[PDB]
Design an enzyme around this catalytic site. Structure first.
Site, PDB file in Angstrom:
ATOM      1  N   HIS A  45       0.814  -1.197   0.000  1.00 17.81           N
ATOM      2  CA  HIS A  45       0.000   0.000   0.000  1.00 17.81           C
ATOM      3  C   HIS A  45       0.878   1.292   0.000  1.00 17.81           C
ATOM      4  CE1 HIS A  45       0.292  -0.039   4.510  1.00 17.81           C
ATOM      5  NE2 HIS A  45       0.177   1.268   4.326  1.00 17.81           N
ATOM      6  N   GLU A  59      19.576   6.478   8.270  1.00 20.86           N
ATOM      7  CA  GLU A  59      18.891   7.678   8.694  1.00 20.86           C
ATOM      8  C   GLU A  59      18.547   7.584  10.184  1.00 20.86           C
ATOM      9  OE1 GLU A  59      17.510  11.223   7.166  1.00 20.86           O
ATOM     10  OE2 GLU A  59      18.616  10.488   8.877  1.00 20.86           O
ATOM     11  N   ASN A  61      17.649  11.101  12.066  1.00 24.85           N
ATOM     12  CA  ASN A  61      16.839  12.308  12.235  1.00 24.85           C
ATOM     13  C   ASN A  61      16.440  12.785  10.858  1.00 24.85           C
ATOM     14  OD1 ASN A  61      16.001  15.144  12.479  1.00 24.85           O
ATOM     15  ND2 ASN A  61      16.859  15.158  14.527  1.00 24.85           N
ATOM     16  N   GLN A  64      17.688  16.670  10.100  1.00 19.89           N
ATOM     17  CA  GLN A  64      19.070  17.083  10.399  1.00 19.89           C
ATOM     18  C   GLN A  64      20.093  16.135   9.727  1.00 19.89           C
ATOM     19  OE1 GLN A  64      19.777  17.210  14.518  1.00 19.89           O
ATOM     20  NE2 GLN A  64      17.967  18.441  15.021  1.00 19.89           N
ATOM     21  N   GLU A  69      23.953   8.896   6.332  1.00 21.66           N
ATOM     22  CA  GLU A  69      22.895   8.572   5.373  1.00 21.66           C
ATOM     23  C   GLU A  69      23.483   8.192   4.006  1.00 21.66           C
ATOM     24  OE1 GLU A  69      23.290  11.574   6.969  1.00 21.66           O
ATOM     25  OE2 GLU A  69      21.365  12.386   7.694  1.00 21.66           O
ATOM     26  N   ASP A  93      -0.077  -7.707   1.645  1.00 22.17           N
ATOM     27  CA  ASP A  93       0.412  -6.330   1.734  1.00 22.17           C
ATOM     28  C   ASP A  93       1.944  -6.314   1.846  1.00 22.17           C
ATOM     29  OD1 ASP A  93      -0.424  -3.403   3.707  1.00 22.17           O
ATOM     30  OD2 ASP A  93       0.456  -3.544   1.692  1.00 22.17           O
ATOM     31  N   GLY A 186       2.664   6.571   8.553  1.00 20.35           N
ATOM     32  CA  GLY A 186       4.061   6.870   8.284  1.00 20.35           C
ATOM     33  C   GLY A 186       4.959   5.771   8.783  1.00 20.35           C
ATOM     34  N   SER A 188       3.844   2.541   8.225  1.00 21.82           N
ATOM     35  CA  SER A 188       3.583   1.470   7.246  1.00 21.82           C
ATOM     36  C   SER A 188       4.786   1.035   6.556  1.00 21.82           C
ATOM     37  CB  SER A 188       2.593   1.951   6.196  1.00 21.82           C
ATOM     38  OG  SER A 188       1.345   2.060   6.816  1.00 21.82           O
ATOM     39  N   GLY A 189       4.922  -0.273   6.373  1.00 26.03           N
ATOM     40  CA  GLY A 189       6.009  -0.758   5.611  1.00 26.03           C
ATOM     41  C   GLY A 189       7.188  -1.134   6.441  1.00 26.03           C
TER      42      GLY A 189
HETATM   43 NA    NA Z   1      19.169  12.870   8.682  1.00 27.13          NA
END
Ligand code: NA
Length: 240
Positions: A45, A59, A61, A64, A69, A93, A186, A188-189
């Protein structure tokens, strides 16, 4: 994640942020799990919309620079062929994303370990949900990665009338439902991490919560059970 705590920055190194291009910027939309150096597992979805996506690994934050990353484009999206977007409760799903480049592993970036096929958690098993989703029903995304402790609720209970009834299938795992802690938009997944024989494995892909709110008593967060899809995952990766 509602009722979570900030995660330590090296606790969950297989967690990814899936983001979409929003004008001049990018915005987090959902979570996922790195399962090969060039493949990510997330919910079907999450990739229903025809957006430009990128994956961010390492990741912590969202707002920032963390110094850790890696940013990588999504080259191919393979959604489970039985997925039907207007029936989340039918299941399937789950989606795999092939990344344009392979990411480099380090203490912030690791492959998720998946359970053995068929594995089912006993009722009340210790698990953590992780993500950057809303911190309250109808709230705002977290800045920093959050974790919440959500013990499992077995199928006999989850599928009972005062919980989810027939909407929960054996291809799903439920966890939480205490009314304080849960998944939220947010998230999800993203992964449900459960400690089995001393080792965290990703047993769930976050799928849905109650329309009456994220943290509602007897409506545990519902996850796709990854151990029902091990052959599917392997078949996709081997054929692409
Ligand atoms: Na960041």
């Amino acid at each position: 994640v509602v009722g979570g705590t900030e995660a330590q920055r090296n606790s969950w190194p297989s967690q990814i942020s899936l983001q979409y291009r929003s004008g001049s910027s990018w915005a987090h939309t959902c979570g996922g799990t790195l399962i090969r150096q060039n493949w990510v597992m997330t919910a079907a979805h999450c990739v229903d919309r025809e957006l430009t996506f990128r994956v961010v690994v390492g990741e912590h934050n969202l707002n920032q620079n963390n110094g850790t990353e890696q940013y990588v484009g999504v080259q191919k999206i393979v959604v489970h062929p039985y997925w039907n977007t207007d029936d989340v409760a039918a299941g399937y799903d789950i989606a795999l994303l092939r990344l344009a480049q392979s990411v480099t592993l380090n203490s912030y970036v690791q492959l998720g370990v998946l359970p053995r096929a068929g594995t089912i958690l006993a009722n009340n098993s210790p698990c953590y949900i992780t993500g950057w989703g809303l911190t309250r029903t109808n709230g705002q995304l977290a800045q920093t990665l959050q974790q919440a402790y959500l013990p499992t609720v077995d199928y006999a209970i989850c599928s009972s009338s005062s919980y989810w009834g027939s909407t929960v299938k054996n291809s799903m795992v439920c966890a939480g439902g205490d009314g304080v802690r849960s998944g939220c938009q947010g998230d999800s997944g993203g992964p449900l991490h459960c400690l089995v024989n001393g080792q965290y494995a990703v047993h769930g892909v976050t799928s849905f919560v109650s329309r009456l709110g994220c943290n509602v008593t007897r409506k545990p967060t519902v996850f796709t059970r990854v151990s029902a899809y091990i052959s599917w995952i392997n078949n996709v990766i081997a054929s692409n």
